[PDB]
Design a protein around this ligand. Structure first.
Ligand SMILES: [Mg+2]
Ligand SMILES: [Mg+2]
Ligand SMILES: [Mg+2]
Ligand SMILES: [Mg+2]
Ligand SMILES: [Mg+2]
Ligand SMILES: [Mg+2]
Ligand SMILES: [Mg+2]
Ligand SMILES: [Mg+2]
Ligand SMILES: [Mg+2]
Ligand SMILES: [Mg+2]
Ligand SMILES: [Mg+2]
Ligand SMILES: [Mg+2]
Ligand SMILES: [Mg+2]
Ligand SMILES: [Mg+2]
Ligand SMILES: [Mg+2]
Ligand SMILES: [Mg+2]
Ligand SMILES: [Mg+2]
Ligand SMILES: [Mg+2]
Ligand SMILES: [Mg+2]
Ligand SMILES: [Mg+2]
Ligand SMILES: [Mg+2]
Ligand SMILES: [Mg+2]
Lengths: 201, 86, 64, 207, 105, 125
RNA sequence: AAAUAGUACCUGAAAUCGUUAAGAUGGAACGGAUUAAGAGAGAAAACAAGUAAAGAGGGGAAAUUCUCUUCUUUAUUAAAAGAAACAUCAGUGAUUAAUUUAAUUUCAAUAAAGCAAUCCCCUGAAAUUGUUUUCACUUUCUCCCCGCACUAAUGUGGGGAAAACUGGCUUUAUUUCUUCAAUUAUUUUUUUUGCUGAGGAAUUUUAAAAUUAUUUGAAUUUUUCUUCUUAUAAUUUAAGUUGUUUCUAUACAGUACUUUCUUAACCCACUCGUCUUGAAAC
RNA sequence: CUUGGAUAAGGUGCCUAAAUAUUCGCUCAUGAGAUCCCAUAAAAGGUGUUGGUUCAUAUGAACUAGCCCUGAAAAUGGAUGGCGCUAAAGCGGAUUACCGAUACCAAGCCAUAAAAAGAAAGAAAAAAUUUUUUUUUAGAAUCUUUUUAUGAGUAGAAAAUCGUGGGG
RNA sequence: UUUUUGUUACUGCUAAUGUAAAAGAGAAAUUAUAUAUGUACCUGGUACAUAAAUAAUCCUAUCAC
């Protein structure tokens, strides 16, 4: 929390645990960008969570539905709303905290070339026993009218191909630098080599 | 009289000896026997094992018998009840 | 002061006078809290209000 | 002088009483009634030849060598001006971090402790306070913003305490420079300053 | 490559409070690498500086500082309670402070 | 809050303003004690006006001293300031509001010769 | 004399409106606590007595002698105060590392020598406490037979043997190879640190107590803190804070210090008066 | 009226100061559950799952009680306080640390109540060189020093104090 | 659409500043969780290799003139 910006990919994280750890960071003052929000997980059966969204859909201002609850249904706006409900967003400071969060579906440019972090205290693999039921956020949001699940998958395929080529070139570079390093160790005075060996560098 | 600071009667040596005219002697004697015993590491503490051999053998049989008897009584009560329950 | 310590620790012939000579002691709260002043010491729960025979020393060393 | 209560042996040094106050119902008197005071008892890592790091002044970051304990608590250091740029200087021991490395542990240098200690005797505590007349001379110059600076630097150079202290500084540097330069890595260590880098946490470090 | 650091970084949280009451005499600080109660005790005497900027000149300069002290810990996670000479304004609650290392031991 | 300069301590500096005097202009700011059922200031609700009490009183040793660290005495002519020649270190003088300039010049000139300070020796110049 | 005293004519408040300037402004506005950022004012504590040479005045005493003071320059000189840092002491807390002597069925290890094999310190099952007698109670990385690779197992299922490596007990001298725990009772110390400093004793801040260095004698615990004010001096641990440097500053109101307004933040805040068991009240 | 320390009731996933603490069990709900007052649920059922008792040669039964489920239908759109939570952030225990009052403890100050005393009086310091210069040199009885404990208030009662037109 | 110095007689003015966050604010495979990734060959399979308290780590920084 002493950095200009943290990039998280939300693939495989539970919605509530992740949203509770983002909100405290934002309140302490830290820009956060969250990507791949369509891969978020929730901890019930898919039917059960669809029932909950159906209940959320049927509450509206009786006299004029233009007001009242707005039923956002993109998978990233849902994380945005769940985070908003863990903040005091009706004060000036708590409204400043909310504006420091950026959410995306997929992985657009500025961030496909950055470093992504995870939060093990919220990973599904570590928190949920293996005979329990769970669902995927993209499937649920497509069931209630989102319509872009296929396109982001098609885009992610190409992104992963480009990343694979990058990784190949990088591994070649590290090997070619390691050989140079191991050759240059014999050209140094023995005292520097001994002190480097003692501390394992 | 005007009131002054109330001094800590335990950790302030002058007032502690003011209230108790015997504390100096007691503290000095305690310090003396403290220094004696710590100076006797690896010179004494060697026979204290000998007195262990002296009196723990004396008390061991009595203690062993007492606890043996308590345990046997508890067991006899168990068997006496189990026989009755049939 | 040692004379009245003696007369208090053992019920000496002068106990009524020595005890009545002192102001009532005013003490701090304990340093690690109570358990539950609602319930008794001898109850199978956390509680405080019974007669705790020799464990009073530990408590009143934490509020002295 | 000393007093000994419960086996502690606190040391006593004389102290003067200065401030005056009002009496209750006739003329005034001095407040303090004490005549001695307890000394300071510096911490058990300040020795004569150890290296240290200045933390506060114009020379923050720079390394130096302890030289003397100055009878008023604080202490004098040189990081030899010939090697470092740090002159004879008086510092509070509470603004220093002291390492575990000693000059007089190198066998190349350990033979010169006595000639170092003979020079350090003349280092004095009164020689560091500038007299009133020098203050008056410098402060008259405020009545072009570049001539005043060197004019101030020139009034300082003619204070006999400054000249006396500079002589000892030169003698120490001349004695101790040639042997230090023989240890290449150590001289480089003395010529550089200390900084904090991330991935070192300051409550697991040792230095 | 210049301007050495010689301090650890910190962030000023709010006041010492409960739910619904404030008590602005003390303030809460977070230190960068410290996240246990026992490691926070290491810093319990150091001086704290809060540096900020203004828009007018005040004594020839546009920077001023408020000085404080590290007094105690705040429980199980490495937060500390600090006391300043004046009260910190509430418009500072995510800003930066310097936990110095002057009173060296 | 508390203000302290030397040995003089003031426990509070803000005034006590009358309840509801910010909302109605027929109500003047001078303090009046609230009487009447359902007041919320008489009953000490949190978040409203405070009441004055004897607790805020000042130290008896420093109760009427000015920042000058002296007491104030108001004079109307040259002869009224005769007693100040014996206690010229504990008192300072102030000139009354309805004395003419000619009288003020004389008063100031005598106060200087007595080594007593004048608080307002710049009026009507 | 004065017309912002022009006849609706002394003074000329509040409600209400105009002009200019400076701010604020997502379905009320004001307010309490606490600070910050701006703007306007300010020297009576928020530095310098005095000395020396003039220049201009104003008094007192014995129209000539001495003496006292206020202003203006010029050049010389101290003192005092507030704040910060460091240190010393005292009062009240946090934090870490130990310790004397006892009690209360504790243990564990290193040499050698031995005792018993379903056997041992124990535990179990049968034949009011004490006693006696039977049968069970170990697995090994060994062997044999059957299944012949059968197992989750770099092995395994069923049935038989042996051994005392392992486990238990006994003699002895060991305890820095290693152990000497835990809980109470009773004593003595230590690392790093937060907050506070009321008072000012013309004769109780004294007496006493403690300390240190010379002494006059006796003990015992036999000693560089061993006791008993059985003689003089000093000191504080007694008898509620003292010191050293720096800054403000070689200033005369400056962007610094004091103060009053304005506008933000964080926490909090229903409309008064009245009758009523009960009022923010539809 | 304040400064500092440590608590009670209750809490420690975010809103919100302090445990995504440790150590044992139970529970899956196509209308789960979430602790005084307190903001509803029954008779009768279950071949859900977990413990226990009693009978019959390694199966068959009969009972018992914990969580879960059926029984369970109303009118604007809505409420374990909200988000949410299933290696719990749920239910029944245990072991520690921590956060938290105008209540508790140590210190200062204001007022109220009581108390110990007082109606005979004399030189202290600093700055300058063994003479000058500053500050003080007290004695008002409903008064002056010093000490301890205490402080909620409608109807109602009393004392002290502040201001206005006239008179001596 | 380079750089240097600055934003310390009057009519509203006619020269003109801000910051919710600099002090190394360093860090681009993918996938699974009763397992993974890379290479080679067949048409997912076979063989070999490599990680497995993996940020509890790598990189970067003082040598002036
Ligand atoms: Mg605690
Ligand atoms: Mg509790
Ligand atoms: Mg009750
Ligand atoms: Mg006032
Ligand atoms: Mg009422
Ligand atoms: Mg006229
Ligand atoms: Mg007239
Ligand atoms: Mg609108
Ligand atoms: Mg044998
Ligand atoms: Mg709020
Ligand atoms: Mg509210
Ligand atoms: Mg009534
Ligand atoms: Mg009615
Ligand atoms: Mg009402
Ligand atoms: Mg109603
Ligand atoms: Mg408090
Ligand atoms: Mg929190
Ligand atoms: Mg049947
Ligand atoms: Mg709740
Ligand atoms: Mg909760
Ligand atoms: Mg009352
Ligand atoms: Mg009338």
């Amino acid at each position: 929390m002493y950095k200009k910006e943290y990039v998280i990919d939300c693939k495989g994280h539970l919605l509530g645990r992740l949203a509770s750890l983002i909100a405290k960071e934002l309140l302490n003052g830290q820009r956060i960008v969250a990507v791949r929000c369509e891969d978020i997980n929730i901890s019930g059966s898919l039917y059960r969570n669809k029932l909950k969204y159906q209940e959320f859909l049927r509450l509206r201002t009786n006299t004029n539905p233009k007001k009242g609850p707005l039923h956002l249904r993109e998978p990233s706006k849902i994380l945005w709303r769940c985070v908003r409900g863990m903040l005091p967003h009706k004060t000036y400071k708590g409204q400043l905290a909310l504006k420091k969060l950026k959410v995306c579906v997929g992985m657009p440019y500025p961030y496909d070339k950055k470093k992504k972090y995870v939060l093990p205290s919220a990973l599904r693999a570590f928190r949920l026993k293996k005979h329990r039921r769970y669902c995927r956020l993209g499937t649920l949001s497509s069931r209630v009218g989102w319509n872009y699940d296929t396109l982001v998958k098609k885009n992610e395929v190409l992104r992963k191909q480009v990343s694979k080529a990058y990784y190949k070139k990088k591994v070649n570079n590290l090997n070619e630098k390691k050989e140079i390093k191991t050759e240059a160790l014999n050209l140094i005075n023995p005292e520097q080599r001994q002190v480097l060996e003692n501390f394992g560098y | 009289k005007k009131r002054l600071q109330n001094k800590n009667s335990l950790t302030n040596f002058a007032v502690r000896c003011r209230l108790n005219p015997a504390y100096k002697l007691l503290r000095s004697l305690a310090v003396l026997r403290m220094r004696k015993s710590i100076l006797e590491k690896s010179k004494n503490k060697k026979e204290k094992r000998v007195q262990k051999q002296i009196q723990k053998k004396e008390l061991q049989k009595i203690n062993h018998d007492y606890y043996k008897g308590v345990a046997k009584a508890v067991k006899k009560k168990k068997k006496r009840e189990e026989k009755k329950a049939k | 002061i040692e004379d009245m310590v003696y007369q208090l620790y053992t019920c000496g012939p002068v106990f009524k006078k020595v005890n009545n000579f002192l102001w009532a002691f005013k003490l701090k709260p304990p340093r690690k809290g109570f358990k539950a002043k609602r319930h008794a010491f001898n109850e199978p729960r956390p509680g405080d209000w019974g007669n705790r025979e020799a464990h009073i020393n530990e408590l009143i060393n934490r509020m002295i | 002088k000393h007093y000994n209560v419960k086996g502690k042996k606190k040391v006593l040094v004389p102290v003067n009483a200065k401030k005056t106050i009002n009496k209750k119902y006739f003329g005034r008197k001095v407040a303090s009634k004490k005549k001695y005071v307890v000394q300071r008892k510096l911490r058990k890592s300040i020795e004569v030849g150890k290296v240290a790091i200045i933390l506060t002044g114009k020379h923050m970051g720079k390394r130096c060598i302890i030289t003397k304990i100055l009878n008023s608590g604080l202490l004098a250091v040189v990081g030899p001006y010939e090697i470092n740029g740090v002159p004879l200087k008086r510092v509070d021991s509470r603004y220093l971090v002291v390492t575990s490395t000693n000059i007089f542990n190198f066998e190349n240098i350990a033979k010169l402790k006595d000639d170092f200690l003979n020079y350090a005797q003349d280092i004095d505590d009164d020689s560091f306070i500038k007299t009133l007349e020098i203050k008056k001379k410098q402060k008259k110059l405020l009545k072009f913003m570049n001539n005043v600076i060197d004019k101030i630097k020139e009034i300082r150079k003619e204070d006999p305490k400054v000249q006396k202290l500079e002589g000892i500084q030169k003698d120490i540097g001349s004695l101790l420079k040639p042997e230090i330069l023989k240890n290449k890595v150590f001289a480089h260590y003395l010529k550089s300053k200390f900084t904090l880098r991330n991935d070192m946490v300051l409550h697991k470090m040792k230095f | 490559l210049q301007a050495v650091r010689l301090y650890e970084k910190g962030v000023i949280l709010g006041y010492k409070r409960s739910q619904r009451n404030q008590d602005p005499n003390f303030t809460l600080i977070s230190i960068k690498n410290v996240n246990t109660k026992k490691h926070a005790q290491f810093y319990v005497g150091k001086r704290v500086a809060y540096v900020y900027r203004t828009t007018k000149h005040h004594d020839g300069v546009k920077i001023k500082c408020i000085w404080g002290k590290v007094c105690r810990t705040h429980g199980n996670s490495g937060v500390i309670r600090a006391k300043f000479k004046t009260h910190i304004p509430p418009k500072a609650f995510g800003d930066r402070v310097r936990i110095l290392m002057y009173p060296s031991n | 809050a508390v203000k302290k300069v030397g040995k003089i301590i003031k426990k509070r500096t803000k005034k006590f303003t009358r309840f509801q005097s910010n909302r109605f202009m027929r109500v003047k700011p001078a303090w009046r004690k609230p009487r009447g059922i359902d007041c919320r200031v008489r009953r000490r609700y949190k978040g409203t006006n405070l009441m004055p009490s004897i607790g805020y009183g000042s130290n008896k040793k420093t109760k009427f001293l000015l920042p000058n660290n002296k007491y104030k005495y108001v004079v109307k002519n040259v002869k009224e300031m005769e007693p100040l020649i014996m206690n010229h270190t504990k008192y300072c003088v102030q000139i009354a509001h309805n004395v003419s300039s000619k009288k003020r010049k004389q008063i100031i000139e005598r106060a200087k010769q007595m080594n007593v300070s004048v608080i307002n020796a710049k009026a009507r110049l």
